[PDB]
Amino acid sequence: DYHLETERAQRQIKQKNMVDWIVRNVMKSITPEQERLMLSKCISDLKAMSIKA
Amino acid sequence: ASKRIARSSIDWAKMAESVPESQKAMYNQFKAKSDGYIRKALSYPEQPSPINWEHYRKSLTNPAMVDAFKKQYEALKVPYPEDKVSSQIDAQEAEAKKEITKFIQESRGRIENYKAELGKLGQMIPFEHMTLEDFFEAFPEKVLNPDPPSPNVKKKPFKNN
């Protein structure tokens, strides 16, 4: 039970800091060229929904 | 296992047919104190809970610790505890056998005496046909010249003062 609790605690801590680092890196992952590409893709999706009337 | 701990006992039915209550009131302890060794015998089995190693293998990313602990558990076996009271109980049993043999010999002697007295009283001449000398032969207390006398030779006319 001690080994199970130790491994589960380490797994939970690893998951928590991985999630926080992923959030921070995603907030650091935005580039203006990719922002323009995502805006163009959103406009294309909105136009595709406009076709589906 | 649970053979000689959980599912065995000694027949107390023949034990209670001899004990003279207040003479052997320690039997009330003996039936009770040993029952305490039966009460803890209700608990304490050999393997109280088998370990599901598959559950720990599924619940752990690395199952090598589970296999190592299973190997260590299988490699260790506890044997039966040491005994040093067997010789003491055998000595008590031998002393009991000697005292029982002596008591049986005394009982045989007392039985022979009682049977001789019963046979003698059966073979006595009846009191209806008994002269006053045959009674004094069969009961040799009599009344003699060097004896405490009385005109009513009774069981309490002399001394008692």
mmCIF file of N, CA, C and O in Angstrom, chain B residues 20 24 44 47 65 71 73 76 85 92 100 118 121-122 124 129 132-134 146 153 157:
data_model
loop_
_atom_site.group_PDB
_atom_site.id
_atom_site.type_symbol
_atom_site.label_atom_id
_atom_site.label_comp_id
_atom_site.label_asym_id
_atom_site.label_seq_id
_atom_site.Cartn_x
_atom_site.Cartn_y
_atom_site.Cartn_z
ATOM 1 N N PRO B 20 -16.455 -33.075 41.596
ATOM 2 C CA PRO B 20 -17.366 -32.856 42.727
ATOM 3 C C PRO B 20 -17.622 -31.385 43.051
ATOM 4 O O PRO B 20 -17.585 -30.974 44.214
ATOM 5 N N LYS B 24 -13.641 -29.440 42.760
ATOM 6 C CA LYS B 24 -12.937 -29.170 41.514
ATOM 7 C C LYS B 24 -13.524 -27.960 40.799
ATOM 8 O O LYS B 24 -13.801 -28.018 39.596
ATOM 9 N N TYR B 44 -7.255 -15.586 13.990
ATOM 10 C CA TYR B 44 -5.936 -16.145 13.714
ATOM 11 C C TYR B 44 -5.975 -17.353 12.783
ATOM 12 O O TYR B 44 -5.870 -18.487 13.257
ATOM 13 N N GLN B 47 -3.498 -18.150 6.548
ATOM 14 C CA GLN B 47 -3.475 -17.041 5.598
ATOM 15 C C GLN B 47 -4.747 -16.223 5.771
ATOM 16 O O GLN B 47 -5.821 -16.645 5.316
ATOM 17 N N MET B 65 8.134 -4.386 -8.839
ATOM 18 C CA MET B 65 8.053 -4.379 -7.382
ATOM 19 C C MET B 65 7.037 -5.398 -6.881
ATOM 20 O O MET B 65 7.260 -6.050 -5.854
ATOM 21 N N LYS B 71 7.739 -12.742 -4.818
ATOM 22 C CA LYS B 71 8.827 -13.703 -4.672
ATOM 23 C C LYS B 71 9.355 -13.735 -3.241
ATOM 24 O O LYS B 71 9.672 -14.808 -2.715
ATOM 25 N N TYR B 73 7.574 -12.978 -0.567
ATOM 26 C CA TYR B 73 6.533 -13.589 0.253
ATOM 27 C C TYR B 73 6.525 -15.105 0.100
ATOM 28 O O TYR B 73 6.310 -15.831 1.079
ATOM 29 N N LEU B 76 9.551 -16.887 1.995
ATOM 30 C CA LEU B 76 9.536 -16.889 3.452
ATOM 31 C C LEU B 76 8.361 -17.724 3.940
ATOM 32 O O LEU B 76 7.212 -17.468 3.564
ATOM 33 N N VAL B 85 7.311 -26.994 27.061
ATOM 34 C CA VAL B 85 6.384 -27.428 28.098
ATOM 35 C C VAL B 85 5.990 -28.890 27.945
ATOM 36 O O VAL B 85 5.261 -29.419 28.794
ATOM 37 N N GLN B 92 4.254 -34.284 34.686
ATOM 38 C CA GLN B 92 3.000 -34.206 35.429
ATOM 39 C C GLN B 92 2.116 -35.413 35.145
ATOM 40 O O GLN B 92 1.441 -35.921 36.045
ATOM 41 N N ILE B 100 -2.476 -42.066 40.665
ATOM 42 C CA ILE B 100 -3.683 -42.806 40.328
ATOM 43 C C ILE B 100 -3.511 -44.279 40.665
ATOM 44 O O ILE B 100 -4.433 -44.915 41.183
ATOM 45 N N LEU B 118 -19.401 -56.440 54.825
ATOM 46 C CA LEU B 118 -20.750 -56.746 54.365
ATOM 47 C C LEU B 118 -21.027 -58.242 54.428
ATOM 48 O O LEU B 118 -22.125 -58.659 54.816
ATOM 49 N N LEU B 121 -21.480 -59.235 58.159
ATOM 50 C CA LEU B 121 -22.787 -58.846 58.682
ATOM 51 C C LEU B 121 -23.911 -59.655 58.054
ATOM 52 O O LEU B 121 -24.943 -59.878 58.696
ATOM 53 N N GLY B 122 -23.744 -60.081 56.802
ATOM 54 C CA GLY B 122 -24.724 -60.974 56.209
ATOM 55 C C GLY B 122 -24.740 -62.338 56.871
ATOM 56 O O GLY B 122 -25.800 -62.946 57.035
ATOM 57 N N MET B 124 -23.963 -63.012 59.974
ATOM 58 C CA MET B 124 -24.235 -62.977 61.404
ATOM 59 C C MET B 124 -25.565 -63.646 61.719
ATOM 60 O O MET B 124 -26.488 -63.667 60.901
ATOM 61 N N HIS B 129 -32.693 -64.833 67.295
ATOM 62 C CA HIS B 129 -32.151 -66.073 67.824
ATOM 63 C C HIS B 129 -30.818 -65.869 68.530
ATOM 64 O O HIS B 129 -30.115 -66.846 68.801
ATOM 65 N N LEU B 132 -27.222 -63.571 74.537
ATOM 66 C CA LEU B 132 -26.500 -62.363 74.914
ATOM 67 C C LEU B 132 -24.991 -62.526 74.859
ATOM 68 O O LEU B 132 -24.279 -61.536 75.033
ATOM 69 N N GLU B 133 -24.485 -63.738 74.642
ATOM 70 C CA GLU B 133 -23.057 -63.938 74.443
ATOM 71 C C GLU B 133 -22.658 -63.972 72.979
ATOM 72 O O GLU B 133 -21.557 -63.524 72.644
ATOM 73 N N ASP B 134 -23.516 -64.491 72.100
ATOM 74 C CA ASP B 134 -23.241 -64.402 70.670
ATOM 75 C C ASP B 134 -23.254 -62.961 70.189
ATOM 76 O O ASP B 134 -22.491 -62.601 69.284
ATOM 77 N N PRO B 146 -11.664 -54.462 83.735
ATOM 78 C CA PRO B 146 -10.918 -53.192 83.638
ATOM 79 C C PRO B 146 -11.526 -52.237 82.610
ATOM 80 O O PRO B 146 -10.869 -51.803 81.659
ATOM 81 N N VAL B 153 -25.001 -49.885 81.644
ATOM 82 C CA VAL B 153 -23.758 -49.788 80.898
ATOM 83 C C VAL B 153 -24.110 -49.210 79.538
ATOM 84 O O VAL B 153 -24.450 -49.942 78.602
ATOM 85 N N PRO B 157 -22.616 -43.021 80.379
ATOM 86 C CA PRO B 157 -22.801 -42.853 81.825
ATOM 87 C C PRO B 157 -21.517 -42.560 82.592
ATOM 88 O O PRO B 157 -21.574 -42.251 83.787
#
